[model samples]
Target: ENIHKHRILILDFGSQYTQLVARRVRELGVYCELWAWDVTEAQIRDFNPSGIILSGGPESTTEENSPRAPQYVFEAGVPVFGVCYGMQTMAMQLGGHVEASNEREFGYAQVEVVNDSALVRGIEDALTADGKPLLDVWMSHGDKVTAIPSDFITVASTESCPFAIMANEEKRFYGVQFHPEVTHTRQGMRMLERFVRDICQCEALWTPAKIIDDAVARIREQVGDDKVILGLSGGVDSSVTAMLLHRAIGKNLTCVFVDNGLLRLNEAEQVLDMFGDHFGLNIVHVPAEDRFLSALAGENDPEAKRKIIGRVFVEVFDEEALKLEDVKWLAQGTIYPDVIEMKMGLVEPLKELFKDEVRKIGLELGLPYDMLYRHPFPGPGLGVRVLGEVKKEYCDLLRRADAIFIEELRKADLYDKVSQAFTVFLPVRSVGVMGDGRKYDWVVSLRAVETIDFMTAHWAHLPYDFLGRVSNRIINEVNGISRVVYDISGKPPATIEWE
Candidate 1:
């Protein structure tokens, strides 16, 4: 379970795909960290990486004062792999010629393997009639390596770039002008696997089961014989945190679940049923809807409503903390991105994990699949989803409508297809008429998006027929929402949620 033993270090040179390189390496069951290119020799020695990767960047290697791989990188006596700008710098650093060009080769290309190299000896997309290997690779570069270093040889070449791939087999150092971290390169994973496993000798030990085992041991060691409390929000991060604490401390772990009334229909009950009734963990359920509603009433400002809800949550959690005798630790769901809080001998078992990694651990902990893969929900819950003022009537209508959309999505097998899908309660009302009957009712909007990261997203192009069915159901079943509209605006001008 010592996943860190075979760690890799990625030196970031400001490439947009630097994190993608780290992700690719991690996907190969190896632990790795991305640091700046200016990292010092002392720091590199302290990290003691089994392998080092120099990531690509936008800067030209021929330019003055451009970043270069630290000298200690080559002297460290570990396998080194460079990509694109990284490759250019590696060549330049080792006394090779890199020519700057106005034209950039920024797309797919076929590289013919002229000589056998350790990294691409057996990896090939096709075999030429002369028995040489040809690789379908993705290239994006403004400069090309014209000459190889004294000790290195050209292993692969494209029509425009002679040294598409260069390697020094004796030193176990390699570089590629094309990117293997991206999926467009047909054999990218295999090339990366070869470097991480065969070349670097890293073990495939970074599995969720091993991660949980390691975390459980660490948690027990940190909080021995002490009571721990977690504010379980029923989100992926906190839920995983609660499970880990329970496994480590057993009866000493107390989870306080607050029902803020802003959650979707039956969300509170589902949370209680899963953690309390099913898992049998020690839970203190606080149904504080009236308190939250009273504070949130007539609050038309979104930012103010968020702050109020947050203040109230802390107040409720503090009250619960006072009730539990001799509690010594507060466990938070603080993952890597949200690493900015704590107190009371803070125990964060999921701190080092990404959201996806946390979900994997949750699955290993026997959590339901649906819970682990659920869409990202705002901390304010339906409070933010209900547009302007947070009122009980609007919340109730939004909750029911949101549930119908979700149910229809699952029934139509489209839930997992979209990244996030939800209903927003608009504040204004519109006219509705059916067979000479006229009345004014509220309008609800549907939001579903597809995105790799929440930073930017595109509106999911859901089937028109499916959208119609959801609109009809929400309008007919939920009495208040007489009209339904679909939000087709992307992230540039419109955010996922209505403010």
Candidate 2:
């Protein structure tokens, strides 16, 4: 944690973009953490931030006991910056007034800088005593500050809201009605830099390279002289953990790569090449494909299949663990988005990062661009990708189809366009056209969806020509696949993947 030379506390009020704000903070080379609006006083105190940021949330402060800023925030004596709902809560809790109206501003907005404030000082704008500079920002709120606290002064105003931005310089508290976190606000990053660096006087020492060094130190210190066993899955998450642990404890960390017989194209060899031959990590390669398949046989039920996989993984990993002498810690790379239901400890280094942030970190670590940019796969690997009666034939076809889809997406420069995209195998057969001959084969469907969080997703509207090309290639290149269908499905109702 020494690499966290300076820190900020971001109090999330259930805003979707809360993590995005924290991402911006990290980009400023300062470490920050996101906590709930009702975080215990002890939690806030322990974080010990140089500044505090309050994020916008969905709940309105006007209704039944709306969420408020914790009582300790005002008493913490650190600089506080509030945005949107954050601004409303700050005003309500500190003797100011807020009101909800039918006039809700929900899109692009232009706010005029009225009175001067330290937050926007030196930003590009014509200087005037009253109103000179104009800021283009994104606004998504129905509530507005009707009155500022007695000690506060109006710094910015828009057509719909007078107190667009307010500041209490003496108290080191600032509030912006518009989101400075989102990129829609043209000067958002600039404003954040000024607040974190110039206003709070926090040094920007947490660069990506420094983060790597810090992560290594922290991992070493956490494990001590004891050995760590890592189950490497060869995905971005497991790969990162393996490489990081190797950097920290060389021989002390043993990475067990269990080829569950269900993996993507060339992933196994790439994992060995990068980590074993290149990095020289202490790795034990277990070719357990047949072991996993044998155990999975006769398991037609999905949940039952999942159980078998989980159980077999543990059994194999335990076998490896037993081989090591005096091993203190057993590590596995099984972290997924759903782990937020947290009984496990947080990956403190990556807890604040977004998919975009993680992608950025991978590039900084000298990881192969393909591994860094490849779409995230599930924990079950290709096991879930196969629909029913997970057979070897279904797996072989699915893997090849998946590779073709991925390769075509990359060729079209659309791999990074969507959140997650992959192929799924359907056991049923279909008929297709051929040169003077009829052919019937298994049908595989392609799914591509876009989501900010995994909570909700929309199907990707890939170009017709691009989709056609991939479909033709998948059908023509692979023998047992006759038809390819794009899943134009909305998710949360229908998940990203088909069971």
> Highest lDDT among the candidates is held by which one?
1
Per-residue alpha-carbon lDDT of candidate 1 for residues 159-238, written as tens digits (9 for 90 to 100): 78888999999999999988998889999999999999999999999888888888989998899998998998889888
Report every candidate's CA lDDT.
0.89, 0.80
lDDT, candidate 2, 1-499, per-residue tens: 4657579988888888887888788888887777778888888888888999999988788887899888888888889999889888888889899987766777887778877789987664343466578888887766867898999999888778888899998988999988888888888899998888888889887677777787777776677777777777877766776766776777887888888888887778888888888878777998888888888887777777778888998899888778777777765443322233202222333443455555566777667888777777877777888876777778888989999998888888888899888998988788866784348888999998888574889999999999999999888878888999999888877888775
lDDT minimum window of 10 residues, candidate 1 = 335-344
Worst 10 residues of 2 by lDDT: 336-345
> Each candidate's TM vs. the true structure?
0.93, 0.92
* RMSD for each of the candidates: 2.4, 3.1
lDDT of 1 at 236: 89
Error of 2 at 93 (Å): 1.1
**Superposed Cα deviation of residue 189, candidate 1 (Å):** 1.6
Mark the regions of model 2 whose C-alpha exceeds 4 Å error after superposition.
Answer: 125-131, 332-361, 433-438
